[PDB]
Amino acid sequence: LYEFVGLLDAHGNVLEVNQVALEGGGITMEEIRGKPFWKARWWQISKKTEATQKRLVETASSGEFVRCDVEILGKSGGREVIAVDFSLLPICNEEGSIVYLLAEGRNITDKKKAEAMLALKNQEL
Amino acid sequence: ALYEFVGLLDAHGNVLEVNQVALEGGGITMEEIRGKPFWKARWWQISKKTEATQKRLVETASSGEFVRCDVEILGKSGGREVIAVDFSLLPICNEEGSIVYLLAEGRNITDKKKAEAMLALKNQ
Numbered sequence: 001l002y003e004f005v006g007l008l009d010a011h012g013n014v015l016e017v018n019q020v021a022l023e024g025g026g027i028t029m030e031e032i033r034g035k036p037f038w039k040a041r042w043w044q045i046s047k048k049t050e051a052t053q054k055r056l057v058e059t060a061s062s063g064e065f066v067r068c069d070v071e072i073l074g075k076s077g078g079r080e081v082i083a084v085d086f087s088l089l090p091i092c093n094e095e096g097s098i099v100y101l102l103a104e105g106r107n108i109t110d111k112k113k114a115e116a117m118l119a120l121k122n123q124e125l
Numbered sequence: 126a127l128y129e130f131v132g133l134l135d136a137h138g139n140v141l142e143v144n145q146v147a148l149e150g151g152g153i154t155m156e157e158i159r160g161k162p163f164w165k166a167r168w169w170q171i172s173k174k175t176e177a178t179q180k181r182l183v184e185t186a187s188s189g190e191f192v193r194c195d196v197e198i199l200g201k202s203g204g205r206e207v208i209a210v211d212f213s214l215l216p217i218c219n220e221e222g223s224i225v226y227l228l229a230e231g232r233n234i235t236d237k238k239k240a241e242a243m244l245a246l247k248n249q
Binding site for chain 2: 005018089091092099102
């Protein structure tokens with residue numbers, strides 16, 4: 001189940017975003033509505049992270065189901081980085097034309113947590 | 126055309142997100158409807174018949190069939206007033222093809238129908 005969710009048009013302009021994602025980034029609808037999703041502050045760690053989001057939007061708009069782990073300015077009202085399992089789902093109309101994209105973010109398990117999980121299981125056996 | 130009201134439903138039609146324009150128009154809070162079937166929400170509650178219609182439309186989209194039709198809803202003045210809406214449901218599939226969400230959209234056509242009524246009188 002997602003944590004962050006957003007609705008984009010086919011070109012990646014922002015239409016709707018849930019409050020959890022806005023509060024996490026310290027971002028308002030007024031700042032991002034109708035402007036490309038990749039320009040919003042969550043994606044602004046670097047020119048590289050913004051370029052990755054732009055490519056994830058463009059490829060989704062071409063009908064790919066894309067997903068990858070990303071770091072975003074998405075905790076403590078945008079002051080801190082979190083890692084997110086990000087996806088875009090193309091949404092087609094009744095003719096098969098992509099008209100929207102559904103952006104979803106889920107939490108990622110800390111590396112040290114996963115290591116602790118396996119250490120504990122090996123130890124419990 | 127771009128929607129005025131929009132909602133995201135799960136594969137079974139339970140409400141996940143709705144825009145503020147639809148909530149304010151219907152006089153509905155996100156807590157009253159989240160995680161519960163879309164046809165139970167107040168927009169669809171003019172009668173048992175309207176609710177049954179929305180239930181069947183949701184179930185149709187849940188099978189992958191796209192829906193568009195005109196409907197009336199309790200959607201203006203905090204749920205006090207009925208408006209006519211051009212309504213659609215888009216099934217959203219994952220890459221495997223399974224339906225994972227439904228997108229509900231609507232545009233108020235109350236003033237379009239009144240303008241068509243006036244044109245019909247003028248033409249006479």
